Amino acid sequence: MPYDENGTPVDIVLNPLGVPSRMNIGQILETHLGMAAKGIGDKINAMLKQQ
């Protein structure tokens, strides 16, 4: 699994080639806000383990 600067393993790998054709644009925007819904969780979680 491709890992980021931190080392978090990815879970799913999809095909980028289908975005321009199929035109699944809202699909990727929900991905970023979904990443943002978890991004704020990342803040909470770390600071919450610190009590």
Binding site: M1, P2, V10, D11
Partner: protein, 155 residues
């Protein structure tokens, strides 16, 4: 909540909304791992724990594809976009072994097998109670009746 279990939801109802006629309490028997139209396990799950009141018109139980009163069809997690060594060819998705290693994504298909019997004009059909020409192995899994004990595994 008065007696929260997995199979029952006993609610000790507040009196300002509890019936002045034969008091009253709310009992709810939840469907337990039963069979659906598509032979998939349906089971209402107790979300509210013991020691907590509820609001009128609120929720006490969820069901599959739903969680805490929220329509949860599938699951969401870390996805990345990249053609990785043909494992994303044409329609192919590439998945991490983690999902099946957790089995948070498993479906339980239950099947109902009807047993026909009961009186034919040539012989009053019983449910076996004995099987000829074979050993007692066929009955070590069944009882005197010929019914298999609840809790086994067949194939």
């Amino acid at each position: 909540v008065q007696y929260v279990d997995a199979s029952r939801i006993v609610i000790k109802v507040n009196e300002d909304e509890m019936y002045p006629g034969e008091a009253g309490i709310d009992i709810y028997n939840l469907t337990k791992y039963t069979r659906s139209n598509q032979n998939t396990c349906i089971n209402q799950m107790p979300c509210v724990s013991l020691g907590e009141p509820v609001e009128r018109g609120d929720v006490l139980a969820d069901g599959p594809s739903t969680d805490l009163g929220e329509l949860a069809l599938g699951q969401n997690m870390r996805v990345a976009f990249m053609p990785w060594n043909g494992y994303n060819f044409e329609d192919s998705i590439l998945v991490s072994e983690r999902v099946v290693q957790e089995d948070r994504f498993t479906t339980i298909h239950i099947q109902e097998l009807a047993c026909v019997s009961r009186d034919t004009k040539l012989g009053p059909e019983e449910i076996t109670a004995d099987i000829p020409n074979v050993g007692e192995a066929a009955l070590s899994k069944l009882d005197e009746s010929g019914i298999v004990y609840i809790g086994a595994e067949v194939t």
